[PDB]
Amino acid sequence: TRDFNGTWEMESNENFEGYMKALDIDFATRKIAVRLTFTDVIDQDGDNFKTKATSTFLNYDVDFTVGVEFDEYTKSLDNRHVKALVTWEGDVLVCVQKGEKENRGWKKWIEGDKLYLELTCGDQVCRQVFKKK
Amino acid sequence: TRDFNGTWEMESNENFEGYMKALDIDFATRKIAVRLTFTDVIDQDGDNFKTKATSTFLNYDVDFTVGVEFDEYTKSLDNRHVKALVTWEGDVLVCVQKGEKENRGWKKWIEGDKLYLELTCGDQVCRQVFKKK
Amino acid sequence: TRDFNGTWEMESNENFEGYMKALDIDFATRKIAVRLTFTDVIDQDGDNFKTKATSTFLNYDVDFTVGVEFDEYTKSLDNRHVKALVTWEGDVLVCVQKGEKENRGWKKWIEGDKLYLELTCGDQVCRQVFKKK
DSSP states (O other), rough: OOOOOOEEEEEEEEEEEHHHHHTOOOOHHHHTTEEEEEEEEEETTTTTEEEEEEEOOOOOOEEOOOTTEEEEOOOOTTTTTTEEEEEETTTTEEEEESSTTEEEEEEEETTTEEEEEEEEETTTTEEEEEEEE | OOOOOOOEEEEESHHHHHHHHHHTTTTHHHHHHEEEEEEEEEEEEEEEEEEEEEEEEEEEEEEEETTOOOOOOTTTOOOOEEEEEEEETTTEEEEEEEEESSSSSEEEEEEETTTEEEEEETTTTEEEEEEEE | OOOOOOOEEEEEEEEEEEEEETTTTHHHHHHHHTEEEEEEEEEEETEEEEEEEEEEEEEEEEEEESSSSSSOOOOTTTEEEEEEEEETTTTTEEEEEEEESTTTTEEEEETTTTTEEEEEEETEEEEEEEEEO
16 A cells, blocks of 8 residues: 555664664764654655654563563663572562672562662662652 | 743754753763753742753654655754655655765555565665554 | 552662663763653562563753742753852843853743743853743
8 A cells, every 4th residue: 555644653673773873873872762662653645745753762671470580681771681580588579680790680679659679780779769650 | 921830842942052062061961952852831829930841852854745856854863964855666665865875765665554664774774663553 | 568560650769870880881871861760560460570661751840939049950951050049030030040150040931822941051042932732
């Protein structure tokens, strides 16, 4: 069909970074665009086209079972490969990420109606708290 | 007129880069902030003000008709000036963007309810697939 | 408790930059990630977990009363500390931000249903106009 009309949500994006590298794009905007997804609204009347490309950040998925070792590529962060294992310590989810970095992992627990997540590596700890919606 | 209450959506942003350069802001976040739009929710009680400044990415717009060469400032990416021409090859939209980069263009076609877009430059092609929502 | 099911919206992010630096993450993606907040939807059936981490830009909140000088940490821009004061010039909000940069401030006013904001540092002025929604 010749009809490109409608709203299109991206599902795949292969060699986007290589394409941008060939375009002589700069490290900053290459790192910006590599963490996105796009939706194109095309309005097409015969041979007249009006396109609008909206971009937002691509969700990151992590699926695991407690006690089962899995392979995690932290595309969210440093894009490293680690072997991750999660355990129950009382009501605490303790995850160890074995790999190049020492003392790397996180701990997650809930107090009241708020969630507490401590991400750790080398000596740097990061404390984040989330509210339930 | 002293009443700033409400949600205000941006329509213009002139010399934002120059303002940030005068603030001597760094290339990374300058490249991030130049691709944004802002919406300010103001709650104003007399002389008391409560600000919310939300930031969103900039919708990239492209309007063209098949067969007429047009001028494209390829923002979103390398911010280059190209002379672009799109043609129908059967049911495929093939556009070549003549400019500094050689063999630069793209192809667009439809299979069922999926859109296929191949962006090309030198030897690097990037394949993207979109689902209709 | 051991039930992490639901949607959790972030309200703090402490030592994120040190954590990312320890991960040997790059200035570009560190500068982007410091300008974000996250919302995680967790689906947990017993010991099976399915997490989805959505990313959205941060919200720059600014609270002031007209005539009272306040302290502003411009995390949106140069991450500088300035002592800011807002005054009425007719129906225009004129704010001076005393600090390292000279002649730094802004002006805000309403014409009809549009908002006009002029950000003024050294020699560079930046004009932004918003439409009321």
